[model samples]
Structures are given as structure tokens and as C-alpha cells.
Target: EYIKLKVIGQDSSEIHFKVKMTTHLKKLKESYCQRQGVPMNSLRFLFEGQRIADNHTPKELGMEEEDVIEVYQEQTG
Candidate 1:
């Protein structure tokens, strides 16, 4: 199973990504940060209105199909 993520931010626009269920959320966040031209250390990930730890897996979070994961870039300032 694959999941799609859409990210939106002030300095950026909406972006879409297709990721496999076997992929960890940390990997997804890293991939998204790479695509956005930002450092992984400078971004934040949230799902279901809760912050996700980098070591946590998607399955452990009980993420389901068509679930929306929001990625917000950290402020540079």
C-alpha cells in the first residue's frame, strides 16, 4: 500500500508525495525535506494533529489509507 502526502507552508506551496506503507514516517519526512530543499533537522512532521517522533513507524501510529500527513518547515529565523 502507498500513501500520498501533501505539504503546505508559507515560503512554499502544496507538494505531493507517494510513499509505501513499508516506509517509515521518518523516511517520509526525510524524503519530503529533501524534495523541499530543506534540511531534515529543520522540519517538523505532524499527523492527526500530533507531532510524530523520528523513530516512530507509520504502522505504530495507526495511520490508515488516505491519511493526510502535514509537513511544516521550520522557521529559518
Candidate 2:
């Protein structure tokens, strides 16, 4: 299964990307960081409008088909 994500940032624009179910959300964050030219450590991920913990799995978070994964770049200031 594949999932789509929307990435947002403080001064950056929104980005859309697709990922596989077998892929970890942490990996998704890495991909988002690369696509947005930000550091993976500085990015956070949300699924269905809820912030997801790094140690949590998508299934454990109640992510379903066509779920929205929102990626946000943390503001340093």
C-alpha cells in the first residue's frame, strides 16, 4: 500500500509525495527533509492531523487508506 503526504514549513512551501506502507514514517521524514531541503532531525510528521512519535508505527496510529500525512519543519526561532 502507498500513502501520500503533505509537507509544510515555517518559511517553506507545501510539498506532496507518495510513500509505501512498508516504509517507516521516520523514513518518510527523511524523504520530506530531502525534498524540502531541510534536515531530517528538524522535521516532524503528523498523521490525520495528529503529531506522530518517532517510535510509533503508522498502523498503531490508526492510519488508514487515503490518510493524510502532514510534515512540518520545526521553527528554530
Candidate 3:
């Protein structure tokens, strides 16, 4: 099945993405960063308040359609 997910930025900006249930979230991460002209890992992705890993998938994370993934700019020391 396909999963439609929403990525929300700190400023309340949103981007929508669709992918297969088995597709790794890393792909989405890359796409988001690329479109925003940023490097991978330059932002923090969170699902249900937990950090999302590169290899995680919708199915693995028990995510449902229209689920929201929050993105926050990385804070470097």
C-alpha cells in the first residue's frame, strides 16, 4: 500500500510526499533537504515525538496515511 505523509517545518510550513509502505524514509529525507537546498541531516525529523532514523519505513513505524513528520533545523554547537 502507498502512504501519504506530511513533513512540517518549524515555521509551520508543510510538504506532502507519497511513497510505498516499504520505502525507506531516508529517500524522503533526501528529497526534502534537496528541494530546500540543504544537506542531508541538516534537519531533525521526528515522528510521534521520537527521532526518525534513515532506514525507517511507514510500515515499520506504524505510520498511517496523512501522518505528520516534524522537521526542525539542526542546532550545532
Candidate 2 lDDT, 22-71, residue by residue in tens: 56677667677787676887777876668877666556676665566666
C-alpha RMSD of each candidate structure in angstroms: 2.6, 2.9, 1.0
Report how far off residue 37 is in candidate 2 (Å): 0.5
- Of candidate 2, the 10-residue stretch with the lowest lDDT total is 4-13
TM-score of each: 0.70, 0.63, 0.94
C-alpha lDDT of candidate 3 relative to the true structure = 0.92
lDDT: worst 10-residue window of model 3: 35-44
**Candidate 3 at 61: error in angstroms?**
0.5
Q: Write the per-residue lDDT of candidate 3 for residues 1-77, one digit (tens) a residue.
A: 89999999988889999999898999999999998889886788999998999999999999999999999887968
Itemize residue pairs with steric clashes in candidate 3: none
Instruction: Point out where model 2 deviates above 4 Å.
Output: 4-17
Top of the candidates by TM-score: 3
Q: Compute the lDDT for candidate 2.
A: 0.67
Better of 1 and 2 by lDDT: 1
Model 1 scores a C-alpha lDDT of 0.72
Q: lDDT of all the models against the reference?
A: 0.72, 0.67, 0.92
